[PDB]
Design an enzyme around this catalytic site. Structure first.
Site, mmCIF file in Angstrom:
data_model
loop_
_atom_site.group_PDB
_atom_site.id
_atom_site.type_symbol
_atom_site.label_atom_id
_atom_site.label_comp_id
_atom_site.label_asym_id
_atom_site.label_seq_id
_atom_site.Cartn_x
_atom_site.Cartn_y
_atom_site.Cartn_z
ATOM 1 N N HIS A 229 9.494 -5.143 -2.939
ATOM 2 C CA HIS A 229 8.085 -4.901 -2.681
ATOM 3 C C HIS A 229 7.810 -3.402 -2.776
ATOM 4 C CE1 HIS A 229 4.082 -5.129 -1.334
ATOM 5 N NE2 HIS A 229 4.200 -6.012 -0.358
ATOM 6 N N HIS B 22 1.200 -1.977 -3.064
ATOM 7 C CA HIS B 22 0.189 -2.087 -2.005
ATOM 8 C C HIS B 22 0.216 -1.028 -0.901
ATOM 9 C CE1 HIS B 22 0.648 -6.558 -3.280
ATOM 10 N NE2 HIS B 22 -0.127 -5.913 -4.134
ATOM 11 N N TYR C 235 2.849 0.320 0.617
ATOM 12 C CA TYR C 235 3.970 0.263 1.564
ATOM 13 C C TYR C 235 5.040 1.298 1.219
ATOM 14 C CZ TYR C 235 1.328 -3.718 3.133
ATOM 15 O OH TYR C 235 0.310 -4.527 3.588
HETATM 16 C C1 LIG Z 1 -2.686 -13.572 3.187
HETATM 17 C C2 LIG Z 1 -2.037 -12.759 2.103
HETATM 18 C C3 LIG Z 1 -0.774 -12.205 2.344
HETATM 19 C C4 LIG Z 1 -0.146 -11.443 1.358
HETATM 20 N N1 LIG Z 1 1.101 -10.902 1.602
HETATM 21 C C5 LIG Z 1 1.790 -10.233 0.607
HETATM 22 C C6 LIG Z 1 3.086 -9.768 0.822
HETATM 23 O O1 LIG Z 1 3.649 -9.944 1.902
HETATM 24 N N2 LIG Z 1 3.754 -9.091 -0.177
HETATM 25 C C7 LIG Z 1 3.149 -8.875 -1.400
HETATM 26 O O2 LIG Z 1 3.755 -8.277 -2.292
HETATM 27 N N3 LIG Z 1 1.864 -9.338 -1.616
HETATM 28 C C8 LIG Z 1 1.177 -10.011 -0.623
HETATM 29 N N4 LIG Z 1 -0.114 -10.471 -0.851
HETATM 30 C C9 LIG Z 1 -0.742 -10.237 -2.197
HETATM 31 C C10 LIG Z 1 -0.398 -11.440 -3.082
HETATM 32 O O3 LIG Z 1 0.963 -11.409 -3.433
HETATM 33 C C11 LIG Z 1 -1.229 -11.519 -4.358
HETATM 34 O O4 LIG Z 1 -0.867 -10.446 -5.206
HETATM 35 C C12 LIG Z 1 -2.723 -11.516 -4.033
HETATM 36 O O5 LIG Z 1 -3.021 -12.673 -3.288
HETATM 37 C C13 LIG Z 1 -3.610 -11.470 -5.272
HETATM 38 O O6 LIG Z 1 -3.390 -12.621 -6.051
HETATM 39 P P1 LIG Z 1 -4.378 -13.888 -5.955
HETATM 40 O O7 LIG Z 1 -5.697 -13.515 -6.514
HETATM 41 O O8 LIG Z 1 -3.777 -15.057 -6.761
HETATM 42 O O9 LIG Z 1 -4.574 -14.297 -4.488
HETATM 43 C C14 LIG Z 1 -0.765 -11.231 0.124
HETATM 44 C C15 LIG Z 1 -2.024 -11.784 -0.115
HETATM 45 C C16 LIG Z 1 -2.665 -12.545 0.861
HETATM 46 C C17 LIG Z 1 -4.019 -13.112 0.537
HETATM 47 C C1 LIG Z 2 -9.566 -12.152 4.818
HETATM 48 C C2 LIG Z 2 -8.911 -11.018 4.032
HETATM 49 C C3 LIG Z 2 -7.858 -10.306 4.890
HETATM 50 C C4 LIG Z 2 -7.163 -9.190 4.105
HETATM 51 C C5 LIG Z 2 -5.899 -9.695 3.401
HETATM 52 C C6 LIG Z 2 -5.607 -8.865 2.148
HETATM 53 O O1 LIG Z 2 -5.341 -9.734 1.040
HETATM 54 C C7 LIG Z 2 -4.409 -7.940 2.398
HETATM 55 C C8 LIG Z 2 -3.089 -8.363 2.238
HETATM 56 C C9 LIG Z 2 -1.952 -7.357 2.510
HETATM 57 C C10 LIG Z 2 -0.786 -8.013 3.262
HETATM 58 C C11 LIG Z 2 0.355 -7.889 2.582
HETATM 59 C C12 LIG Z 2 0.171 -7.249 1.428
HETATM 60 O O2 LIG Z 2 1.082 -7.015 0.632
HETATM 61 C C13 LIG Z 2 -1.289 -6.829 1.224
HETATM 62 C C14 LIG Z 2 -1.867 -7.433 -0.072
HETATM 63 C C15 LIG Z 2 -2.612 -6.373 -0.894
HETATM 64 C C16 LIG Z 2 -3.919 -6.898 -1.507
HETATM 65 C C17 LIG Z 2 -4.642 -5.770 -2.262
HETATM 66 C C18 LIG Z 2 -6.038 -6.182 -2.756
HETATM 67 C C19 LIG Z 2 -6.084 -6.269 -4.292
HETATM 68 C C20 LIG Z 2 -7.461 -5.906 -4.879
HETATM 69 O O3 LIG Z 2 -7.786 -4.696 -4.864
HETATM 70 O O4 LIG Z 2 -8.152 -6.843 -5.343
#
Ligand SMILES: Cc1cc2nc3c(=O)[nH]c(=O)nc-3n(C[C@H](O)[C@H](O)[C@H](O)COP(=O)(O)O)c2cc1C
Ligand SMILES: CCCCC[C@H](O)/C=C/[C@H]1C=CC(=O)[C@H]1CCCCCCC(=O)O
Length: 363
Positions: free
Chosen positions: A179, A182, A184
């Protein structure tokens, strides 16, 4: 141009039945850092034969958590408890990678040993306008001032990644994903909008990558390149993780990984790239990376289908839709209906409500 989300694929060791991937997703059900039957249940539901899955972000060391009730893979207790989840996935013939996660400054004293400061590349806190850490009690508070690492300290944090990867395999996992996205820990070294370092871990783009490079190197050394994926997000501002030039950064990461595969002799499992939600940037990194490309962020069926048809991606990972739809792969196949996701139960602790009770498609 005849390949689809439903075409089989060879990912080095793993023969995939289709291209639809479960994105890593923090759900906070692993009470007290230990996985459980609910996780096994939830991942199993989502498993299809030859289907690829990525686990929620998983702790690599005490201090690496910025969320409540996220799982770990640094202790023997954690390793043993993970076994059920993996075995459950394997039974239904799926593949699963453990995402290795360090939040860096994106933490709180609460999640830190002895109540210490979170570690980062910088001493700068995350700004306090847009971003709040979520605490075990459900409240949201400001991110604290982190402690910047000594150079001498970094090899230890890399060793944390190794042990975690070694535990992951020992727990039955098919591999691990780094990872590095985002905002981190890793991204805090990569992005020049965070990394204000004087030393060899900051300044030049090559220097900003040095941390990831070592992490990827150590993990590959431990378990083999073929069982390692890397996730990056060059164009995502989450937690003040901006770069002056995201395209050069992404290409510096892509370039780093290519030039590493010659050094090792074997290819990584994949490169995983997330979009915020130009499109040239994605296509650019794809051409540039010599290996499997998993693209993510804001995808649906049509976008995912055309990405594969055009050669933009080998694999496409789905987040929000996979929460609401345990049988998403089937729904895409028959162009069926999609359950809507409920935001409120994303990070709740219930084993059932909002977690495993999203209904399968009726016969
Ligand atoms: C509730 C939630 C938790 C997430 N946790 C992680 C995470 O732990 N590690 C990570 O790399 N991305 C995390 N993401 C980002 C997702 O991996 C993914 O890139 C993001 O949902 C955008 O794709 P989508 O449009 O299909 O939802 C999380 C997203 C959501 C909505
Ligand atoms: C109801 C929405 C709550 C916020 C959740 C959001 O998707 C954040 C998630 C973080 C937790 C673990 C991760 O790795 C983060 C995901 C990064 C999402 C970035 C947004 C991407 C964009 O700019 O569209």
């Amino acid at each position: 141009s005849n390949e689809t989300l439903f075409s089989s694929y060879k990912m080095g060791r793993f023969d995939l039945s289709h291209r639809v991937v479960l994105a890593p997703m923090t759900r906070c059900r692993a009470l007290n850092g230990v996985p459980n039957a609910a996780l096994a249940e939830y991942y199993a539901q989502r498993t299809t034969p030859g289907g690829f899955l990525i686990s929620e972000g998983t702790m690599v060391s005490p201090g690496s958590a910025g969320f409540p009730h996220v799982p770990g893979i640094y202790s023997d207790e954690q390793v043993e408890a993970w076994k059920q989840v993996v075995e459950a996935v394997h039974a239904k013939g799926g593949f699963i990678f453990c995402q290795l996660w360090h939040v860096g400054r994106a933490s709180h004293a609460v999640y830190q040993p002895n109540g210490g400061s979170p570690i980062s590349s910088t001493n700068k806190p995350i700004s306090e306008n847009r971003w709040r850490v979520l605490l075990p009690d459900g409240s949201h508070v400001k991110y604290p001032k982190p402690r910047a690492l000594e150079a001498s300290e970094i090899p230890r944090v890399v060793e944390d990644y190794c042990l975690s990867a070694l535990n992951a395999i020992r727990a039955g996992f098919d591999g691990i994903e780094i990872h590095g996205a985002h905002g981190y820990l890793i991204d805090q070294f990569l992005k020049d909008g965070i990394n204000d370092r004087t030393d060899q871990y900051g300044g030049s783009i090559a220097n900003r990558c040095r941390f990831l490079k070592q992490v990827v190197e150590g993990v590959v050394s431990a378990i083999g390149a073929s069982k390692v994926g890397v996730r990056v997000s060059p164009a995502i501002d989450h937690l003040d993780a901006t770069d002056s030039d995201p395209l050069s950064l992404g290409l510096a990461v892509v370039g780093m990984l290519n030039k590493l595969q010659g050094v090792n002799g074997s290819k990584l499992a994949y490169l995983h790239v997330t979009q915020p939600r130009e499109a040239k940037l994605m296509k650019s990194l794809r051409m540039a990376y010599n290996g499997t490309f998993m693209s993510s962020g804001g995808f649906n069926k049509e976008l995912g289908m055309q990405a594969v048809q055009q050669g933009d991606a080998d694999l496409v990972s789905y987040g929000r839709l996979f929460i609401a739809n345990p049988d998403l792969v089937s729904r895409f196949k028959i162009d069926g209906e999609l359950n809507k996701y409920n935001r409120k139960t994303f990070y709740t602790q219930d084993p059932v409500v909002g977690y495993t009770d999203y209904p399968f498609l009726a016969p």
